[PDB]
């Protein structure tokens, strides 16, 4: 889940403050690639 990835621990600072992955990046499910976008009669779609 994105929640589990977001709390990946990158490092701990000297003051004990924790740097988590979600502190340097946005975490979301998204396409392996974003190159293909299809429409069926003008409406968003997928297909095979």
């Amino acid at each position: 889940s994105t929640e589990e990835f977001g709390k990946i621990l990158l490092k701990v600072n000297q003051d004990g403050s924790r740097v988590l992955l979600r502190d340097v990046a946005k975490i979301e499910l998204g396409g392996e690639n974003y190159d293909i976008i299809a429409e069926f009669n003008g409406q968003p779609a997928s297909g095979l």
């Binding site: 998204g30 690639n33 974003y34 190159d35």
Partner: protein, 48 residues
């Protein structure tokens, strides 16, 4: 030996300085809408 080097150093340097390196694209997907140009980035390529 004069320069305190060995064949290990030679091999490491050749592998680093004669190599193909993947980069990416300018304006690649998913883009910021309004992007006007999409182009491949070419980085290190093999010596000739």
């Amino acid at each position: 030996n004069k320069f305190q080097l060995t064949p290990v150093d030679v091999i490491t340097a050749i592998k680093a300085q004669n190599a193909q390196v993947a980069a990416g694209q300018l304006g690649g997907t998913p883009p910021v809408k309004g992007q006007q140009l999409n182009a491949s980035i070419i980085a290190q390529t093999r010596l000739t």
